[PDB]
Structure 1
Amino acid sequence: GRVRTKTVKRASKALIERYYPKLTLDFQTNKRLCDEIATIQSKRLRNKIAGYTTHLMKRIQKGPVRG
């Protein structure tokens, strides 16, 4: 199954907190934003982050998310 790891989610929270205005609900733009404000050592990882970060946004923007 598809469970995102700590290093992933750990990054998403970290990104979101200090970049909420800069980020959107769209995967591809966010994906790009990662190349600027973060230095990720591989593409799959970077997308995976960009993907979960975009996931939280799409529910953050529907009510405050626990952490």
Structure 2
Amino acid sequence: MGRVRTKTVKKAARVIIEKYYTRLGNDFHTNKRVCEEIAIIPSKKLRNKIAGYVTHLMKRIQRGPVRG
């Protein structure tokens, strides 16, 4: 309960999966480090949230065609 990802974490996630699909992967840690050179994210709790939802899309985008 209560772990819905706000617009910002989701909205940032989609941008960095279209800007940088090839570099990213399905690892939370590898992606959480790319999000450290591809974006100026003010908070650490924000990138890990952004990195977390990126995997959900990158896991999902490998199969289905997400709107990104």
TM superposition score normalised by structure 2: 0.93
- The count of corresponding residues between Structure 1 and Structure 2 is 67
Q: Counterpart of 2:39?
A: 38
Map of 1:14 onto structure 2: 15
Q: Alignment partner of 1:57: what SS?
A: helix
Coordinate RMSD, CA, aligned: 0.9
Shift of 1:8: 0.8
Q: Which runs of 5+ in 1 are unaligned?
A: none
- Identical columns (%): 73
How far does the alpha carbon of each residue in 1:20-66 deviate from its partner, in whole angstroms, 9 at most, with x for none? 00100110000000110101001110100000011100011011113
